[PDB]
Amino acid sequence: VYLDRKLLTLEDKELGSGNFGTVKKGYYQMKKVVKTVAVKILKNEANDPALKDELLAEANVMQQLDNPYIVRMIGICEAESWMLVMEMAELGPLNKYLQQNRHVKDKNIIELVHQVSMGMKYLEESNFVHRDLAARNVLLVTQHYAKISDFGLSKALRADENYYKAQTHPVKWYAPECINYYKFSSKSDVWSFGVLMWEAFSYGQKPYRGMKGSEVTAMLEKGERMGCPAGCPREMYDLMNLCWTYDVENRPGFAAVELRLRNYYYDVVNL
Numbered sequence: 001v002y003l004d005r006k007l008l009t010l011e012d013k014e015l016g017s018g019n020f021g022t023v024k025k026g027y028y029q030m031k032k033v034v035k036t037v038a039v040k041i042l043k044n045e046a047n048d049p050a051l052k053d054e055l056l057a058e059a060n061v062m063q064q065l066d067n068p069y070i071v072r073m074i075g076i077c078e079a080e081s082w083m084l085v086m087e088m089a090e091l092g093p094l095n096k097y098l099q100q101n102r103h104v105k106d107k108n109i110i111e112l113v114h115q116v117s118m119g120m121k122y123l124e125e126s127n128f129v130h131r132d133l134a135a136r137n138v139l140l141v142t143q144h145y146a147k148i149s150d151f152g153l154s155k156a157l158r159a160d161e162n163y164y165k166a167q168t169h170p171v172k173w174y175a176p177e178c179i180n181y182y183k184f185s186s187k188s189d190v191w192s193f194g195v196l197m198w199e200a201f202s203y204g205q206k207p208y209r210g211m212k213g214s215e216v217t218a219m220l221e222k223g224e225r226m227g228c229p230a231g232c233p234r235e236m237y238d239l240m241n242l243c244w245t246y247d248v249e250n251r252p253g254f255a256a257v258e259l260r261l262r263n264y265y266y267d268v269v270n271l
């Protein structure tokens with residue numbers, strides 16, 4: 001679990017950047033083979049151990065998760081910086097990939113979001129809230145194999161509550177109960193999966209283009225939702241709207257969302 005920096009080699013170039021630091025391709029020498037890895041490296045000119053604790057929390061969540069459609073942690077490494085080492089998904093973020101591969105078919109995108117729904121079904125069963133479910137945090141192992149990434153904001157739910165109460169705030173992916181009451185549940189992940197599906201079938205376009213968060217909030221408060229993406233199957237658009245049910249209780253969970261994705265995939269495969 002605590003990895004050896006000497007057995008790890010990092011690429012000089014970055015896969016992607018952010019607030020924390022960098023994400024880099026690496027190779028980690030395992031039993032007698034090497035494993036290609038992606039490594040989240042924390043920038044600390046200064047120690048600010050606060051950020052450090054966030055990385056170990058992110059690791060602490062991944063540690064407990066075991067599913068084919070969730071990114072696997074190899075472990076963490078304390079070296080010239082703090083590092084979270086993960087199994088490499090070579091093709092990278094779904095949104096960027098679909099931007100650059102418009103030739104990809106409906107059926108393929110349905111397969112991809114269905115795999116995400118399966119990964120989220122597991123997360124729901126395990127009582128973890130993702131809290132950041134978007135197309136940028138779906139990574140492709142192949143064109144036909146997707147994995148959910150980025151657990152920096154995830155929370156293990158309490159055994160007596162089905163939700164997590166946050167502090168002050170991503171708005172475009174948040175269900176209304178998150179905006180108004182700061183309440184995060186598997187149902188708010190379901191709302192977010194709706195936005196993610198909209199992203200997928202728009203080939204990586206941004207949701208609610210050119211709108212401030214308060215305008216998005218206001219639009220949703222008056223019963224309005226994003227329009228159908230050009231070319232999107234009707235059944236997937238219908239599913240998006242069901243995911244954007246205002247009322248938390250009547251909004252479906254991932255079990256029901258997954259099932260409705262199975263059936264339509266097989267329908268598209270058998271049409």
Ligand SMILES: Cc1cc(C)cc(Nc2nccc(-n3cc(CN4CC(O)C4)c(C)n3)n2)c1
Nearest residue numbers: 015016023038086087088089090091092136150
């Ligand atoms: C070609 C390419 C580019 C990029 C940016 C990522 C990969 N794939 C890969 N694989 C395993 C883990 C990660 N992780 C990437 C991250 C950073 N996330 C990508 C979300 O956009 C932020 C994390 C926590 N794990 N990423 C592949």
